[PDB]
């Protein structure tokens, strides 16, 4: 019984002003960079997961796999981590995302799973059967983990494997992405479902797109690197290049530090990127126009971020015009603070009004 709209309609829908480029700081001073760098690695160390909690995620997987195969024997039911839990970007307070696979299609009834998990002591058990991807949500009070589960959405397993591959290519990607994600949680702009802002997966695509567009690039366009694609276990070629040992080091030509990349990330999205004209596409690794995708007609197209496996889908579709204006303001707010090295203020915890 509470409204979670992050960006109030009183914000309006107007485009932000194009700032005189000579007034937009182009690089960190040496003092600001050095201190921001040490602050970011201190933040990253606190964000890194601990082994005790990582063990709890795997125990939840095992517990769930046992519950399911005991209740419905014979169907080779398997339980897989994905999302943050499988792409190297989770922290200890990250929820668990789980994909349950089986050829037994009758398991795709998420409320049947809710009844079983409730009966065996899970708490806050809810099922959402009308979502694009039906889910069951639980709180495990023994392991103290929140968990969203779906059944047989293998597409999410592949784009998790893709993000994991991107994270594995250059060692700056994991700390950069974790710190930006932490920023999105603290400013509460990571809630596409109820807040009208952007999903964590949308944010990760924006980070990867920015890194692909650096000169030199930090990350390649994996979907376009046909010669480094391996054959998967199902016999088909991978959709994206995934021979990690051959890919590792691709970004080594780019010599910018973590501090400079965080500054440039916010500078890019605060002032450089023309939201009105372009679509970000980590599938291509280059900018696309909205018009070449017919996305000038798309409802909720202020921000266009192409899903790399279904390029008909805009990940930015959860932000209407008002929400985009507030997101853009948050990105400029972040740029102004990181330009002066103020990582703590940048990550101030947003609280909803009463
Ligand atoms: Cl993630
Ligand atoms: Mg989740
Ligand atoms: Mg529009």
From TrEMBL:
Residues of the full protein shown: 245 to 598 of 1275
Domain Poly(A) RNA polymerase mitochondrial-like central palm: 36-167
GO molecular function: metal ion binding; poly(A) RNA polymerase activity
Annotated residues for binding of Ca(2+): 95, 97
Disulfide bond sites: 111-127
Ligand binding (Mg(2+) 1): 97
Keywords from the UniProt entry: Calcium, Magnesium, Metal-binding, Transferase
Similarity comment text for this entry: Belongs to the DNA polymerase type-B-like family.
Chain positions recorded as Mg(2+) 2 binding sites: 301
Domain PAP-associated, first and last residues per copy: 257-311
Name of this protein: polynucleotide adenylyltransferase
């Amino acid at each position: 019984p509470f409204s979670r709209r992050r960006m109030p309609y009183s914000l309006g829908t107007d485009k932000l002003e194009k700032v005189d480029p000579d007034k937009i700081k182009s690089k960190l001073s040496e003092d600001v960079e050095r201190k921001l760098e040490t602050d970011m690695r201190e933040l990253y160390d606190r964000l890194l997961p601990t082994e005790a909690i990582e063990v709890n995620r795997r125990e939840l997987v095992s517990k769930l796999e046992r519950l399911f195969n005991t209740e419905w024997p014979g169907h080779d039911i398997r339980v897989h981590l994905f999302g943050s839990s499988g792409n190297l970007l989770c922290s200890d307070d990250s929820d668990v995302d789980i994909c349950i696979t089986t050829p037994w299609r009758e398991l795709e009834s998420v409320c049947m799973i809710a009844e079983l998990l409730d009966r065996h002591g899970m708490e806050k058990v809810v099922c959402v059967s009308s979502a694009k991807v039906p889910i069951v949500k639980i709180w495990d009070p023994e392991l103290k983990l929140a968990c969203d589960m779906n059944v047989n959405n293998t597409l999410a397993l592949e784009n998790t494997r893709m993000v994991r591959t991107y994270v594995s290519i250059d060692d700056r990607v994991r700390p950069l992405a974790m710190i930006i994600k932490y920023w999105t949680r603290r400013r509460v702009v990571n809630d596409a479902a109820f807040g009208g802002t952007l999903s964590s997966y949308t944010w990760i695509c924006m980070i990867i797109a920015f890194l692909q567009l650096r000169d030199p690039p930090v990350l390649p366009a994996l979907h376009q690197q046909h010669d480094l694609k391996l054959v998967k276990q199902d016999g088909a070629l991978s959709d994206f290049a995934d021979d990690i040992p051959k890919l590792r080091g691709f970004g080594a030509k780019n010599k910018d530090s973590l501090a400079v990349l965080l500054f440039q990330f916010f500078r890019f999205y605060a002032h450089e990127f023309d939201y009105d004209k372009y679509t970000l596409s980590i599938r291509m690794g280059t900018l696309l126009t909205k018009a070449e995708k017919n996305w000038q007609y798309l409802v909720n197209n202020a921000l266009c971020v192409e899903e790399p496996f279904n390029d008909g889908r805009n990940l930015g579709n959860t932000a209407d015009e008002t929400s985009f204006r507030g997101l853009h303001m948050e990105l400029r707010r972040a740029f102004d603070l990181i330009a002066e090295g103020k990582l703590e203020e940048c990550c101030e915890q947003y609280v909803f009004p009463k």
